[PDB]
Amino acid sequence: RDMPLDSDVFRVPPGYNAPQQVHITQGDLVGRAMIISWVTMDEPGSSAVRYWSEKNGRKRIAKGKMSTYRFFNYSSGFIHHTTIRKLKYNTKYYYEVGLRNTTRRFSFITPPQTGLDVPYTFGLIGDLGQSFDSNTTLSHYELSPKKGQTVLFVGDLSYADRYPNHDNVRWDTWGRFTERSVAYQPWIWTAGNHEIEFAPEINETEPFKPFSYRYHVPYEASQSTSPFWYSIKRASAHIIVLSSYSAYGRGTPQYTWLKKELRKVKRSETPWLIVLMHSPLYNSYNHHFMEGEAMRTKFEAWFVKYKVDVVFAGHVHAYERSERVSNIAYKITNGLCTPVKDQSAPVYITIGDAGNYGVIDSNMIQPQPEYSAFREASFGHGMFDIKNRTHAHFSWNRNQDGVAVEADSVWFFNRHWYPVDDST
Amino acid sequence: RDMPLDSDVFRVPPGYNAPQQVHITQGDLVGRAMIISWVTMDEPGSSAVRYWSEKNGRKRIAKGKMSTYRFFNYSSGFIHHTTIRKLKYNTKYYYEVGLRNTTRRFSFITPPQTGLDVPYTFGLIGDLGQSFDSNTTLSHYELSPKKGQTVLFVGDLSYADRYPNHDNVRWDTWGRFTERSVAYQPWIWTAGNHEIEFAPEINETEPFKPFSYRYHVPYEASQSTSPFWYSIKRASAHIIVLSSYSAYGRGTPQYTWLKKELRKVKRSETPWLIVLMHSPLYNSYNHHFMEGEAMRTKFEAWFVKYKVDVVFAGHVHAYERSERVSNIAYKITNGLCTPVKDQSAPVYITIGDAGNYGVIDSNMIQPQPEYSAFREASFGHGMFDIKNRTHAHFSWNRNQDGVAVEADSVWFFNRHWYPVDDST
Ligand SMILES: *[C@@H]1O[C@H](CO)[C@@H](O)[C@H](O)[C@H]1NC(C)=O
Ligand SMILES: *[C@@H]1O[C@H](CO)[C@@H](O)[C@H](O)[C@H]1NC(C)=O
Ligand SMILES: *[C@@H]1O[C@H](CO)[C@@H](O)[C@H](O)[C@H]1NC(C)=O
Ligand SMILES: *[C@@H]1O[C@H](CO)[C@@H](O)[C@H](O)[C@H]1NC(C)=O
Ligand SMILES: *[C@@H]1O[C@H](CO)[C@@H](O)[C@H](O)[C@H]1NC(C)=O
Ligand SMILES: *[C@@H]1O[C@H](CO)[C@@H](O)[C@H](O)[C@H]1NC(C)=O
Ligand SMILES: *[C@H]1O[C@H](CO)[C@@H](O)[C@H](O)[C@H]1NC(C)=O
Ligand SMILES: *[C@H]1O[C@H](CO)[C@@H](O)[C@H](O)[C@H]1NC(C)=O
Ligand SMILES: [F-]
Ligand SMILES: [F-]
Ligand SMILES: [Fe+3]
Ligand SMILES: [Fe+3]
Ligand code: NA
Ligand code: NA
Ligand code: NA
Ligand code: NA
Ligand code: NA
Ligand code: NA
Ligand SMILES: [Zn+2]
Ligand SMILES: [Zn+2]
């Protein structure tokens, strides 16, 4: 089901050393920066990025860094990463890449300054891959009636690791394919199990190697010491990104960072507290059932204590929306091991149904558990539309439907500013 | 309670560039190799080690590597690691270090070839530290009527991380302190939370940095890609070392390694399957209560399926021995969350009461849970004395009793060669 190499979506842009696989993401904590990334295949080229606003058309230049890597018998092209800083809020900018030779121009609109009642619409995509279904999902995100301004990617990008020797060529195709979206609006990356790429058989033992080279994140901005876990603030949301396949035992770097980070969250500045992770803590599907238990025992109580609004995960190739529940009262022998309704707990949503390599997870645990509000084995994507400090409307759009149809939609009542029961 | 710097046990060996902090560990998979480690403070010196059999007085030389590191404003002396290989079984060997200038001689006895009924006695020490209690525990072990032939260290070594800026000098003192034992018999290293040393405040973001530089392990011998988890075979035991503070999520390096390692175990060759980890999966004490839950969800079922004989851990500053139980039938809503008797399960023992910095954990969950067979808050060490392929004798010696007293002692009946109920 994977799209052939000659497909139009994997078309290489014309012109000598023409920049390709162009993508961007927030480059600082508050939204005044952006990391611009792209690859050149003919030669190193320049890492300089020329930019300017639509209004204050003063053209400026930012220098970046170039790098390369090798996997098996695969050798990458020239990967460029450049950060544009001190940008003005809510203003459109134009940026050009490939100044040395063939130049290409794109644009993006910085988010508005963070604040209590700042509206913003987040796209939710997980386990995209590069199958025909992946193309449909992405198209639906773009043609969505509601204008998505940033994508929160829950993990599992290209699925190159399914090819022989993980044929990283499939990483480059994925970059050209998603360019039509990521180059114009930021995607906040989460690391999934397909990015680990631990392959001892072929002497490739550095976890997340290809992914980490191709996709950078502003982790130092939140005092994290690893790109696999970090935080950013955008508009009225505080987004926390975690790594399911990194150490999370007590005292470990990720564990320690998260504990301190939850303490720095200010619901007065960013009322919507969102958490991303690849593997779902709540999942009633057969596939990967209970794989989220470990991390759950570790962080669930914290999510409840700090009343996180939502937790988005992927991994399971389907869709699921839980009720607000918790299972934090277990003590080995007290028998309290059943999830109970907890209005202080976040809703857990799994949206790893963007397409992957074309397979869907339909085998579900039966009967549907009480903690599971809604579930369905269809390809699709989601949208978290923040209206204000009290309301956020989440909707799920299926690939079999019209780009404007919402097979499932719910209103989120902020755990901090609107303590009302938003159950369905 | 930590012993003062001028303590006799921290004395520095005389002579220019005299080798100090000498220690050894198995250097291969089966026991025909040994890693010799030591530090020189006055100058780099030579990494060559001269060794010879007590029988075959032929003196040979093994070349090694030297390294150094810095923590904060601390600069280490010169660290040497040299592996002596192709040794003969069950034979006494003499080795000398510091050949360049001041030389020091020591010895060790290679274990006998691996076999079904090969007897061997392993000492168990966890969370030693360097307080006076630490000195007492080490004394008892050296004076044990039953001589220990190899120590299985279950994590938390020097506790230097408790000093300002983790004053790494406390790593050097611990090195001299433990020498009187580790330089003659190998100690099998397990990494605990005090080795993590994650200190972002002073730009020390590399987990296990000091520990990984000072203590090496033959991790590649078992095809592991990290020194924090590995396996070795000694006599009639197959030992698996795990990292409580490394990633263990499905698909991670450690997770994958263990899954395959277990498949390579051969009970027809090494009948005793022993697992070491720092954080206990079963712990009825208040301190660190339920910290091992995450790893348990991940590996408990594997331990039961492969019928591990024993699992040793530390972390809790006390002693505990559990019944053979398993808590692997939980499915979120089926209500099966109570540990039950399971003869396929290993016994879980907490033995992190070697002394640490002089504090003991006496507060425990009341009443004592069914899964807990024996628990007591006293400083001490354990002894796992393997007799045959079918019998092994474990004993716990407290620091307040005579060196040959056994406050707790039980016979272990091999899960593969003598599966009889050994409850207490
Ligand atoms: C890597 O090896 C495969 C076959 O093992 C081969 O088809 C492929 O072309 C090699 N990669 C390159 C581009 O050298
Ligand atoms: C492409 O750009 C590089 C930038 O240094 C330059 O050296 C090279 O001459 C250019 N190629 C041509 C001749 O078009
Ligand atoms: C992918 O979808 C886009 C937009 O709908 C379309 O233009 C393109 O032809 C599709 N490519 C493939 C290979 O289906
Ligand atoms: C937030 O927006 C919703 C519209 O979706 C509206 O009904 C609600 O009254 C607003 N709440 C506040 C705090 O103004
Ligand atoms: C290291 O720095 C500390 C202050 O943080 C100071 O008290 C100590 O004397 C210094 N020691 C060394 C090794 O210079
Ligand atoms: C000490 O040994 C080193 C290592 O070979 C040598 O370079 C140096 O000259 C020696 N000095 C003394 C005091 O023996
Ligand atoms: C502890 O170690 C041995 C115990 O036999 C003894 O020789 C030594 O003096 C003691 N050291 C300290 C400082 O307690
Ligand atoms: C080993 O010794 C124990 C106790 O002496 C005995 O009960 C057991 O049967 C023996 N096992 C073998 C295989 O010799
Ligand atoms: F997946
Ligand atoms: F500890
Ligand atoms: Fe996936
Ligand atoms: Fe300890
Ligand atoms: Na799978
Ligand atoms: Na699977
Ligand atoms: Na998968
Ligand atoms: Na504590
Ligand atoms: Na503590
Ligand atoms: Na501790
Ligand atoms: Zn996944
Ligand atoms: Zn510990």
Side-chain angles (χ1 to χ4, degrees), chain B residues 289-365:
Chain B
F289 180 51
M290 297 195 284
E291 282 186 24
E293 288 293 280
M295 187 179 270
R296 184 177 70 75
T297 65
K298 246 47 177 171
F299 306 150
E300 198 187 351
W302 295 1
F303 295 164
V304 171
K305 171 182 181 176
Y306 282 97
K307 299 181 190 291
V308 296
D309 293 299
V310 209
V311 174
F312 289 112
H315 202 40
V316 173
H317 301 159
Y319 172 66
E320 181 164 27
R321 184 177 104 261
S322 79
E323 283 279 306
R324 289 183 182 289
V325 298
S326 69
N327 184 15
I328 62 171
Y330 179 57
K331 294 175 178 302
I332 308 298
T333 57
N334 65 357
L336 301 184
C337 55
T338 304
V340 65
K341 296 171 187 294
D342 197 334
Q343 286 304 302
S344 277
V347 173
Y348 293 84
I349 294 170
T350 298
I351 193 69
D353 63 334
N356 62 78
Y357 49 103
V359 179
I360 217 287
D361 297 316
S362 53
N363 181 33
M364 42 189 103
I365 304 304

Side-chain angles (χ1 to χ4, degrees), chain A residues 193-194 288 315:
Chain A
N193 65 305
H194 277 280
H288 305 312
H315 203 40

Side-chain angles (χ1 to χ4, degrees), chain A residues 2 71 129-130 156-171 192-199 201-202 210-211 356-357, chain B residues 251:
Chain A
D2 266 17
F71 195 69
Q130 54 195 99
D156 275 10
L157 292 64
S158 70
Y159 287 76
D161 73 326
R162 295 180 71 271
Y163 287 73
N165 299 132
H166 304 205
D167 194 345
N168 276 209
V169 166
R170 281 293 182 171
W171 261 111
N193 65 305
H194 277 280
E195 285 69 67
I196 300 176
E197 298 204 51
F198 181 60
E201 341 78 63
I202 49 179
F211 171 63
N356 60 76
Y357 46 103

Side-chain angles (χ1 to χ4, degrees), chain A residues 193 196 198 200-201 205 207 223 225 244-254 256-257 282 288-298 327 330-333 335-339 369-371, chain B residues 193 196 198 200 205 207 223 225 244-254 256-257 260 282 288-298 327 330-333 335-339 369-371:
Chain A
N193 65 305
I196 300 176
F198 181 60
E201 341 78 63
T205 64
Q223 290 66 60
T225 58
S244 304
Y245 311 109
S246 276
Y248 47 71
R250 182 170 175 85
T252 64
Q254 183 177 204
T256 304
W257 175 84
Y282 279 90
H288 305 312
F289 178 55
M290 295 191 286
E291 273 182 38
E293 291 297 278
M295 184 177 270
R296 187 201 121 226
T297 67
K298 241 44 174 179
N327 182 12
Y330 182 58
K331 296 190 176 303
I332 311 302
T333 59
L336 300 183
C337 56
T338 299
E370 195 197 76
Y371 66 78
Chain B
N193 57 303
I196 298 178
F198 180 62
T205 65
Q223 296 71 60
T225 52
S244 295
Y245 310 102
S246 279
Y248 45 77
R250 182 165 197 192
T252 63
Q254 178 177 206
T256 303
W257 176 83
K260 296 187 174 187
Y282 279 91
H288 306 304
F289 180 51
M290 297 195 284
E291 282 186 24
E293 288 293 280
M295 187 179 270
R296 184 177 70 75
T297 65
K298 246 47 177 171
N327 184 15
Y330 179 57
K331 294 175 178 302
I332 308 298
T333 57
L336 301 184
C337 55
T338 304
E370 291 281 60
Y371 69 77

Side-chain angles (χ1 to χ4, degrees), chain B residues 69-84:
Chain B
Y69 75 94
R70 302 175 69 136
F71 194 68
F72 177 54
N73 62 317
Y74 169 92
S75 292
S76 84
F78 314 100
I79 307 161
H80 304 82
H81 290 295
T82 302
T83 308
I84 302 179

Side-chain angles (χ1 to χ4, degrees), chain A residues 231-395:
Chain A
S231 191
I232 57 160
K233 291 172 183 176
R234 174 157 284 247
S236 60
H238 192 135
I239 305 165
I240 293 178
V241 183
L242 301 173
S243 174
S244 304
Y245 311 109
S246 276
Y248 47 71
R250 182 170 175 85
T252 64
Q254 183 177 204
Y255 182 98
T256 304
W257 175 84
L258 181 60
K259 196 177 186 175
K260 305 192 182 302
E261 177 64 29
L262 284 167
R263 285 165 169 54
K264 294 199 289 198
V265 174
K266 286 149 73 181
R267 298 299 195 116
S268 298
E269 190 186 319
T270 59
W272 297 94
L273 179 58
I274 304 171
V275 170
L276 314 178
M277 62 176 64
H278 183 64
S279 188
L281 305 192
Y282 279 90
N283 161 216
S284 72
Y285 282 77
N286 217 292
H287 201 198
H288 305 312
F289 178 55
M290 295 191 286
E291 273 182 38
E293 291 297 278
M295 184 177 270
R296 187 201 121 226
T297 67
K298 241 44 174 179
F299 305 143
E300 169 167 39
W302 296 0
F303 296 161
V304 173
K305 175 182 182 192
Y306 285 95
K307 302 184 198 307
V308 306
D309 291 296
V310 208
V311 172
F312 291 113
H315 203 40
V316 167
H317 299 154
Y319 172 67
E320 177 157 33
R321 208 189 80 235
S322 75
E323 293 179 358
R324 286 186 181 287
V325 301
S326 70
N327 182 12
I328 56 174
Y330 182 58
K331 296 190 176 303
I332 311 302
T333 59
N334 60 359
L336 300 183
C337 56
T338 299
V340 63
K341 295 185 179 171
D342 192 331
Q343 282 292 309
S344 181
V347 169
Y348 293 84
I349 288 176
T350 80
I351 33 282
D353 63 329
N356 60 76
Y357 46 103
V359 183
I360 211 288
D361 288 308
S362 45
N363 295 150
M364 323 184 289
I365 297 297
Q366 217 64 63
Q368 165 174 42
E370 195 197 76
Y371 66 78
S372 183
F374 186 107
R375 41 135 81 151
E376 185 182 301
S378 288
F379 287 111
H381 73 97
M383 276 280 237
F384 193 71
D385 201 7
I386 293 160
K387 298 303 183 182
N388 45 39
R389 68 186 161 73
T390 65
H391 292 251
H393 192 179
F394 174 78
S395 63

Side-chain angles (χ1 to χ4, degrees), chain A residues 16-17 43 45-46 99 101-102:
Chain A
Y16 183 68
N17 210 212
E43 60 172 273
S46 170
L99 315 190
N101 317 87
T102 299

